[PDB]
Amino acid sequence: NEDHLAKELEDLNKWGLNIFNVAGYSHNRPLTCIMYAIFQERDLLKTFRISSDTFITYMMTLEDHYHSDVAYHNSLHAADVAQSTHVLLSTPALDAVFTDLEILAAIFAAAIHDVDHPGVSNQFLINTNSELALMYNDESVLENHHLAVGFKLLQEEHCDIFMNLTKKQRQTLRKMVIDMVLATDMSKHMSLLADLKTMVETKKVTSSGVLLLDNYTDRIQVLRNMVHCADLSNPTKSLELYRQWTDRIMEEFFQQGDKERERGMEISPMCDKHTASVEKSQVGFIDYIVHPLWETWADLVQPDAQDILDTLEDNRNWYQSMI
Numbered sequence: 001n002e003d004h005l006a007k008e009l010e011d012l013n014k015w016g017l018n019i020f021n022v023a024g025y026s027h028n029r030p031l032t033c034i035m036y037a038i039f040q041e042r043d044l045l046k047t048f049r050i051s052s053d054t055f056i057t058y059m060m061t062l063e064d065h066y067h068s069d070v071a072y073h074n075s076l077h078a079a080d081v082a083q084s085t086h087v088l089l090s091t092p093a094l095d096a097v098f099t100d101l102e103i104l105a106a107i108f109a110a111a112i113h114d115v116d117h118p119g120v121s122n123q124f125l126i127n128t129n130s131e132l133a134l135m136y137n138d139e140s141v142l143e144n145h146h147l148a149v150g151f152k153l154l155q156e157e158h159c160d161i162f163m164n165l166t167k168k169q170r171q172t173l174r175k176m177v178i179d180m181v182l183a184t185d186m187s188k189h190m191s192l193l194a195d196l197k198t199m200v201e202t203k204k205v206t207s208s209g210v211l212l213l214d215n216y217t218d219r220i221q222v223l224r225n226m227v228h229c230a231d232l233s234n235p236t237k238s239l240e241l242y243r244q245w246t247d248r249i250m251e252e253f254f255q256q257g258d259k260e261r262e263r264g265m266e267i268s269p270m271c272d273k274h275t276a277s278v279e280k281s282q283v284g285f286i287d288y289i290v291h292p293l294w295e296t297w298a299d300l301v302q303p304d305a306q307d308i309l310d311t312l313e314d315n316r317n318w319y320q321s322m323i
Ligand SMILES: CC(=O)CCCOc1nc(Oc2ccc3c(c2)CO[B-]3(O)O)c(Cl)cc1C#N
Pocket: 073, 113, 114, 184, 186, 231, 232, 234, 235, 242, 245, 246, 249, 270, 281, 282, 285
């Protein structure tokens, strides 16, 4: 059990760590396990003076606020996005670019980015006049909610993992976490990608081949896009992992479609279990959203995302051939 978990964690810094196996060998606590592994690996507990007790207590409470009965948006997805963000932060083209605070903020943002997900989209909550949609004026409804829950849990007993940060560090980390979690709202996708394309068109590179960022706006725009990339990373993983993610998301999508049908609402795209094709949906999703994003990311950090983009294109063509 312990030796098996240790074997899986040999791939902690690698794309396509088997987070499903990590969940199995950690007794369904992948987020707490992988976050403790990541924080020890990066010396984040030492650097920001976080005790193991305080970190574990917060992470266990955070993981408890992910819904076990939802198929996709549970703590396994959060753990996957955190570990993928951890890998993207160590991409050679971004070496020595980001501060320790920015690294902390990105991994934390990824860990909390879907906390307390009900298993339905923003459009469902807007169209049903949900309390959450009312609270946030239909704007990034769930993403605002994820931030609210993630931050409020820091105020629980023995849970303030940012207690030993400076005042300016706490204020700046709050801003950056908000930016990165809000960047997972699909409504901001086209604007984020447009900014990413602009940075690629006007990128400054060193002799060693490292990206140069002049100001805070350029840094946060890359970090926003990084977490967005990590959130949309399932199709870029090895096919056996990607197929498992596809099974989970379609189960959650069909459950929303069932709720929409019984309420007498119009069923959302990819959510009608009677008519929808899993294979067509993935190919369409890759072509219009995931591939444009990752191709632009690959251009920013060239050649570091070459195998990732190749995997995305191979998985796209495989799924297309199964239509
Ligand atoms: C195996 C996969 O690749 C599933 C990706 C998630 O499935 C989709 N998500 C979409 O938009 C969101 C993307 C990210 C997130 C959410 C919605 C809510 O929370 B979240 O942060 O996880 C859209 Cl437009 C299409 C699909 C499809 N298929």
